Structure formats: C-alpha cells, structure tokens
Design a protein around this nucleic acid. Structure first.
Lengths: 88, 218, 129
RNA sequence: CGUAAAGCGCACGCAGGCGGUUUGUUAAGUCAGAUGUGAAAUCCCCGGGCUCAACCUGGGAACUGCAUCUGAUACUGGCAAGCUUGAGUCUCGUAGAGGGGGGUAGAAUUCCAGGUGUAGCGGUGAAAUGCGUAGAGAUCUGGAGGAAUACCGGUGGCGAAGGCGGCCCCCUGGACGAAGACUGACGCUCAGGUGCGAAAGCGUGGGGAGCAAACAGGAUUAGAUACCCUGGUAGUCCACGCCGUAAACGAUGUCGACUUGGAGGUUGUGCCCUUGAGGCGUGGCUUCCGGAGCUAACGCGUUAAGUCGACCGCCUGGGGAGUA
C-alpha cells in the first residue's frame, strides 16, 4: 500500500497524537491518501481491473466512515472534508 | 483400585468418541482407560450378574476372538454355564428356532457317534458325518445343552461381537461387555471399560466373572 | 451477523441437549438472564451462573431426566424479521398446557400461565415444549 | 430450490429490511383499563309464539375495528451517554500461476539459403490424394518469424467469479499470522443501479510459425454434405472498443452462531534436552472418509444438504416456450 513514513505523517497530522491510529478522521485520511496515489497509478494501466477492485473497496469504506462521522459529529465532518478537499 | 493388575487400556486406532467418559488417555498415541472408573463399573456388573446368577439363570459367555478361546470354554465350563468361542452364528438368539434343530442334529449325531451305528455301512460317509460333528461341535459347542434362550449375555469384545449385542438388545437380554476404546456402548446394559485383546486381562476378567457366577444360593 | 441473540441462546440449548452436553456457555445479557431465570423456575434447566466482569458469560447447567433430555423442543416465536405481540386472550398454551411459553410483559419476563394469571399480555419470545 | 420446477455468472452499493452491549429519559409500536362509536336485520347462546319444523320474536354475546383518555415499561423504536467480545486502523513479517506494463531465455514446429546424399517420403485398418530424381525424406550449418512456455507440477497455490504456469524489473490489489496500541457498532443483506465477466463472435489497425471452423481433394460407405487421410482460409496472437453468454457447476446466494471424530495437504507461529526421521500447542485455507442429525433415496456430514437467525434471488404439471 502506502509508505511507513507517509502513514506515520498522516497519523501525526490527523490524530489526537501518535498511537491514535484508528480514529475516524485518521482512517479517512489514510484511505484518501491511497485513493489519490492510485489515481496516478490507474490513469496509466487502465485495465488493471483487479487492483481497481481494491480501490473501490477503499472508496466505499471511506464513504461508510464519512457517513458515520457525519451522523456522530458534524463539526468534525465539516473540518475533515474541508481539510481533505473531498466532496467537490 | 487394582483388581485389574496388568492391562491399563489400549487401541490407539479407530477410537470411539462415545468412550470419552472412560479415557485417561496419555501415553505414546495409545489411549489409557481410567481404571478408577472401571472398578465401580465392573463391581456393578458382578453385582447384577450375581443377582441373575442366583435366580438360576443362564449366562452365555461370548469369546470368538483369540485367545478368548479356550478361556471362555474354561471359564464358562468351570461354572455349569454356556459359551460361544468360535464364530458366533448370525441369529442363534433371534432365530433360536432353527438353531434349535441344528443343536438337535448335534445331539442325535453324537448319540449316533460314540454309541450307536458309526461304523455302519460306509467309511466315507462315516468320515463325512464325523466332520459334521466337528463343524456342529465347534460352532454349537457350549450352547448345545442350554435348551432355552439365556437370561443374560456376557461378551468379551463389543465391536468384534456386535452381532450378539445387537440380538440380545433385540430380545431384551442384559448385555455385559468389556468394551475397549474402539468399541461402542450400543445397548450394553452393563458396560465395563477394559481391555478386550490381552489374555492376562481376559483371564483375570473372566476369572472374576466365573468366580461370581458359581455362587447361587448353594 | 448476529441479529437475534435470543434465538442464538435457544440454539445453544437445543444443540447442547442434542449432544448430551453438560453445560452451555454464551455471552450474557439482561434478557438472556431473564429467560434463563424463567427456564430454571419452570424446571427446564438445572442452574445458571453469570460470570465475568467486562464480558459476562451466562452458563446454563442443562437437565437430563432419563437418558432422554428435558428440553424437548425449544422454538423462537417473536423473531426480528416478524415480531409477535399477543393480548391476554390470544396468549397461547403450548402442548395443551404442558410446556410454557415465555412472554415478555410489561411487568417483566414471565410464562404464559403467570402472565395470563397477572391479567396482561405481551411479546411472546419462545415456546418451550 | 445438490439431483424432481427453482440460487442471479460474480461482486460493489443506494433506497429498503434487520441490527452486539450497559445506563438514563421518552412511551411511538406493545400491553391493561375506561369512554364514544362499530345502524337494524343476519351468524352464535339462553328463552318465547305459530300443533312441530321452516318461520317469527325477547334478552344477551358478537361485530375480531377505529378514535380519545388513563396507566405499565419487559421487549422493539426515538433521544442522550457509554462499553468491548462485531467491524475497522496502525506496527512487523510470511506464502502466493492475484492484476497491469516492459524486457529477456531455452527447447521445438514451419519457412529461406547452402553442404552431404539418394530413391523414396508421408499416411492409414488398408489405401489413395499429397510431396519427390527440377533431388524429396534423412542429416549438418547459418538466418527469419510467430505462438506457447516441458521438467518443477502436487484432489498444490492465488483470485469475488471468469480465470491466472519460463525467468527478470517496474507499478499495484488482497489474504494470513505474532504481540501491542487506537476508533468505538462505524455492522449484515440488497430490489432498481453500477462494475467485472471463459470461449466463440463483431469493428478498426497490426501480426500470422503451429493448429484449424469454412472449403477442396482422397478414401470409407448403399449413400457419407461425417468419423479417417492430405491440404487449408477466417479464427486463434497483439492494441483499442463492442458483445454479454456457458454443464459461467461445489448443478449448493450472502453474512453470523452452535453441534461427536479420524487421516492428510498447504501456509503462519509459540513453547519445551534438538540432545531423530524432536516433542507439545495455537491460528488461515484446503482434500478424503465417516458419527448424530437430515434427506424420496442417492448422499451431505464443524467448508452441512444438521440445529437456528437476517436479508436477497427464484419455483408452482409436461409440451407449446424461454418462443411470439
């Protein structure tokens, strides 16, 4: 998947601290990082239909977590999707 | 505790999960029967078995495998009781009717044999008839003087002699079996977790049973 | 996923009676302890015991009368797919009275005899026959 | 609903249905009571009158409902707060024909050029067509080209399914294991919808060694539009798009829980004289046989076709017809 240094950087940016690596913002940001990186991979190749299935699992799982965090705390939702530049 | 000196259980192979209450089960892939469970079981079997033995009943030891012979002939015949030591015929209890006339032919042919006309009229047919007495004598050996179907049944291996257990359950006869860890307590009314194929174990074992049979009211 | 833990409990007891099992453990809850208290009270199980602190574990010591098993047929009636709420007049008797039906009434989890005597119906959880 | 008709080819997922566990509040569902109403006749019950009966009739019950008010709060729902046993994230490794792109290697077939060499070669049940003194076949050397990747190779592995087999690099998906940390029900299923989906086929552009529908010849045969033989085009191969199906099959939907065993395979790992071809455990996936149980039987049998729960799909005699 993603680099150890990259995952550590995103956990450090979005968590309450390091070791808070399962929080909803953190998981969303890690999924987001990998989705964008693989935008770069699937612009090329384009017939890697197996890897894409992994990608659509990432998209769907991000969506589930955004729905959770939307119906738990909406302020965290707006700050989160504001910071990640998603939602369009 | 130790009446059962030397057997401690057997049968690594084809062990049966229904023998799980009776297994201590440690050493070298083989299963050890919990003989601290066997001793109350075997004392109960001696209790009810002596109880029917004192009511003037017939016991029918069953000993087809070797060397249960002649240990079942020795133990049954040490009492005034009955036995099967060679191949147990399929249906000598549940059609005893037809087996009654085979026993009748054994009696008529031994009476004809050692007393009557045995040298009469042929040598070849006389040899034929004598080996009919060997076949009818080793198959219908102990049971030939029974004259009823018996009041209990004592089998020495439950899986090897499943036919006799199945028939005595079919007829309402109390089955007294020494099961091993491969056997199954089918309809054995008085199960005894022991060792079926050790001659020390079955001579000790039948020694105790034949000891408690030959105490009636006396 | 687990969506009916009560039917899971009754499944544990059917398959424990069917396997000559001495005792049955499961995760515990308030409703399972209520039902289990009804079953001990009516004589279908021998005892229950809830252990653990942070993850409670209900344990039902089962009954066997003869070689046969005591709980002859336990069924789940008000499943989550379709819930069944009977009044005090519609409240059924199982095996013509020889077998209780555990109904959750507002006063608590009772039997059919006890809640028909209390004068109030409710949600019929399970038939124990 | 394995084989009788019936499990979508496989997944992702919206609306929908269902939802672990604890406490508090509400009381919508649920329950109890009350009130209003539910026309009369009819049905039912207990009586009465026609000589009886049908019939007529008195009183009740009933009209299983709806609305409102009063309560109960166990279950379900709403709301608030949690909790970790479900789900997920992070750390470290493991195995793998998982995918896509690029390169390369060795055997072999065909073709071309050349040397030797000479009368057959090939083929079949037998033959003939076919190739061959214009020198075939055999054999050696050099070259070109395309496709596939022996041995390993294994009821072995990976993948949702279709499927994926030289070796190397690059990009990339998933699974599993060990200890610990974190989030805290974030879950399950899924009509419409969307995606992937062997082979054949279609479109455009390449490629084309072998194999080979069509086709042609030779046989066989009563005939032979076949099986067999000799050739042989599309196709098979590549790029991009379409199609959208298969005995797409474990003829077995997905997810979760429980219920005796045995022998293996494969991939993790801990412990303990290792003092072997060690011992003892604990996971993941998988093969064979079998117990209870189930099953019309056959068989399935902890990877269920057993015992349950959630949601979906489908069936309703054969044909006509999966056709118009």
């Amino acid at each position: 998947s993603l680099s150890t240094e990259a995952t550590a950087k995103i956990v450090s940016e979005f968590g309450r601290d390091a070791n808070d690596t399962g929080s909803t913002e953190v998981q969303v940001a890690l999924l987001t990082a990998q989705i964008n990186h693989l935008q770069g991979h699937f612009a090329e190749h384009k017939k890697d239909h197996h890897s894409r299935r992994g990608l659509l699992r990432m998209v769907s799982q991000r969506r589930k977590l955004l729905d959770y965090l939307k119906r738990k705390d909406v302020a965290r939702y707006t700050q989160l999707i504001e910071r990640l530049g998603l939602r369009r | 505790m130790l009446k059962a000196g030397v057997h401690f259980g057997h049968q690594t192979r084809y062990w049966n999960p229904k023998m799980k209450p009776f297994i201590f089960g440690a050493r070298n892939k083989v299963h050890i029967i919990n003989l601290e469970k066997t001793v109350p079981m075997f004392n109960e079997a001696l209790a009810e078995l002596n109880k029917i033995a004192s009511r003037k009943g017939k016991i029918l030891f069953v000993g087809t495998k070797r060397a249960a012979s002649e240990a079942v002939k020795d133990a049954a015949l040490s009492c005034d009781q009955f036995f099967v030591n060679h191949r147990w015929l399929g249906g000598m209890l549940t059609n005893w009717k037809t087996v009654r006339q085979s026993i009748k032919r054994l009696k008529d042919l031994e009476t004809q044999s050692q007393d009557g006309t045995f040298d009469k009229l042929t040598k070849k047919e006389a040899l034929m008839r004598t080996r009919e007495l060997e076949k009818l004598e080793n198959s219908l050996g102990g049971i030939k003087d029974m004259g009823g179907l018996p009041d209990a049944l004592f089998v020495i291996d439950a899986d090897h002699e499943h036919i006799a257990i199945k028939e005595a359950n079919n007829l309402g006869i109390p089955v007294f079996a020494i099961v091993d860890t491969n056997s199954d307590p089918d309809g054995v009314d008085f199960v005894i977790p022991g060792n079926d194929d050790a001659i020390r174990a079955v001579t000790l074992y039948l020694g105790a049973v034949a000891a408690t049979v030959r105490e009636g009211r006396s | 996923s687990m969506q009916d833990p009560i039917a899971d409990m009754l499944t544990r007891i059917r398959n424990g009676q069917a396997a000559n099992k001495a005792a049955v453990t499961m995760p515990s809850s308030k409703l399972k302890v209520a039902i289990a208290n009804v079953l001990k009270e009516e004589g279908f199980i021998e005892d229950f015991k809830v252990e653990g602190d942070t993850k409670p574990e209900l344990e039902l010591t089962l009954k066997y009368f003869q070689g046969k098993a005591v709980v002859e047929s336990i069924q789940r009636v008000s499943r989550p797919g379709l819930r069944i709420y009977k009044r005090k007049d519609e409240l059924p008797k199982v095996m013509a009275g020889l077998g209780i039906a555990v109904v959750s009434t507002s006063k608590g989890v009772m039997t059919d005899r006890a809640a028909r005597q209390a004068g109030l119906g409710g949600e019929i959880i399970c038939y124990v026959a």
